[PDB]
Design a protein around this nucleic acid. Structure first.
Ligand SMILES: [Zn+2]
Lengths: 58, 70
RNA sequence: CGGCACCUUACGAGAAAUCAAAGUCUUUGGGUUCUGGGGGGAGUAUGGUCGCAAGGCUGAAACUUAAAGGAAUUGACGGAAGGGCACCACCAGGAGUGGAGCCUGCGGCUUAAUUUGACUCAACACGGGGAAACUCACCAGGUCCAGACACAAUAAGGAUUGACAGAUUGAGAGCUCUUUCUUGAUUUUGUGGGUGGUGGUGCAUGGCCGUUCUUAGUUGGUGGAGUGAUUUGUCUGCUUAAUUGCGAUAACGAACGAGACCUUAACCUACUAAAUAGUGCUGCUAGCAUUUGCUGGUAUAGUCACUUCUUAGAGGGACUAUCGAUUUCAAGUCGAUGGAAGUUUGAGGCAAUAACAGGUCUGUGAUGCCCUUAGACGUUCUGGGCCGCACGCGCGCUACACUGACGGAGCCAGCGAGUAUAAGCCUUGGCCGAGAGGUCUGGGAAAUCUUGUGAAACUCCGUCGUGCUGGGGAUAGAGCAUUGUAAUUGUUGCUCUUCAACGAGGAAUUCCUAGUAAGCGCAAGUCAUCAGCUUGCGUUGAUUACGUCCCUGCCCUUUGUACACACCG
């Protein structure tokens, strides 16, 4: 989060503004690249076929 | 929060006293002659010739460098 | 068969609540009687009629008004119910405060001003607000323009500024008055235009902070309900610090907040190194017994080794782990074992949706409007004030004695701060002074030196012996120093003296569950001087719960509403 507060001069008084903008965590290159609770699960490598008992000699 | 009320009368600033051709008084011109320099211009090393003392009572002063004689 | 009704559903109706009739009504017609045409005025006036009367029945208009009203929804509120959580609630306790003096603040009073903001929690050692000068906004005095810029006025035959002697003034302010000197187009007058204000307006505002509330709450996507605003999700029950999970389920899966996350504390003989840290060896040396032992100093060349302890960087380590129970066997909880740690591992930082007439224009060259703006409410400088005292209240410190006072002896922490041509920092070590303080050197711009900050409680040894005692240090005098231009209304300390109440605190009420409460000291801050105050740190170190909704507060649900500017209605 980066913020910038400015008071734009009006003839009637003070108008204060706040702008709060977030770079995407995936777009970060310096600090963390995600949220602390962001848990990313890898996919299963299973569902292969195993044959009883051969021997492979290269 | 209080209306400032005065007692002492209004004081007025000094106005520089004006004269007509004060330059004339410092010199006397003599026919077929030269300058008089009657006001005893300051001989101090600071200010040279041409600008004079002030023939006050019992003193002679020039404003540019502060000193009085006799 | 007749009845009084009841329950479910809504084919159907209805604005909906709801309705087996309020259905068979724009697909408008079974028969018939009565009544209404926005709210008032008004069921009033008048007439008639009945009545003993009270009154009944029939029954207007003038004028007035843009609404009144029905049903339901969300919120708000309730001197309504039901639950839940909480040492800013209680249980059981501990420590208190409230009783005396004193520092400080508030109001009050006085005042020349005793500036002022704030008044339940969320005002009152709060504005870091511990005010000699300055701060200061106040009071009695005096200067400066530091009024830019475009004009009109004046001006070289000088627009005007600085000023020696005296007078005056607090002033050695040429501020001014007599004094006539002095520079010269910068500049003197009026206007426009401004400029500046601790001036008013925080009920015109921003920003920040506090409160709701650090409670746990908030919202949308698709689906269901409803004509709709909306509702469900977002809930009977258990559990958790917790809308956090289990569980139940017209909802399913998500997002914010919580939790996660970050900083700090505890572990590391396992790595990475450390002469600004230490140790052990080795030299060189000193003491005592002479056993070859025990204790110091020294070695920025002993040109030694190491990181256990000291420091920090890379990591690992805890995830309620294993086991008994209890429970829906689920979320969890309780007892043990191991472990450095089994209370969210400890403490904090951050911290949702909208908001409050909560507080501040007395922090800003942050501002809108009103006032002033040259005899300035700007500024500066002088002297005074915030301290002023018949009074009520609050945060606290000394204490009320013996677990104690002193007087000796023991002698152990941790967080931190620091300068050069300044305008003076920390200041050692030595030398004087009873002390406070004074003098001469050095080191440190910094794990080096100040500083091991050798702190106090505490430990031991004696004096005192329940006495307002030697427990306590108020009131008051004298002298000695430091700070600062300036200490008088005593800055502050020291020496002597003065020896006050206070002999445990009514009604009330505050904080708190483990290195915690309570004692005990030290540092940083505001600071030229001043800390009974905060912010931190460390020493010693407990009693009792580990439960509940009895008080209080808040949250949630149900409920009621004629409120929505929302009961201060
Ligand atoms: Zn001269």
């Amino acid at each position: 989060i980066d913020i910038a507060i400015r008071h734009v001069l009006m003839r009637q008084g003070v108008l204060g503004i706040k702008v709060k903008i977030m770079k995407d965590p995936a777009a970060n290159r310096f600090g963390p690249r995600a949220l602390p609770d962001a848990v990313k699960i890898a996919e299963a490598k299973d569902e292969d076929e195993v044959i009883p008992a051969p021997t492979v000699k290269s | 929060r209080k209306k400032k009320v005065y007692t002492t009368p209004k004081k007025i600033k000094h106005k520089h006293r004006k004269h007509k051709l004060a330059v004339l008084t410092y010199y006397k011109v003599d026919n077929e002659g030269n300058v008089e320099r009657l006001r005893r211009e300051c001989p101090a090393p600071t200010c040279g010739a041409g600008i004079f003392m002030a023939n006050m009572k019992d003193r002679q002063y020039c404003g540019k460098c502060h000193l009085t004689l006799k």
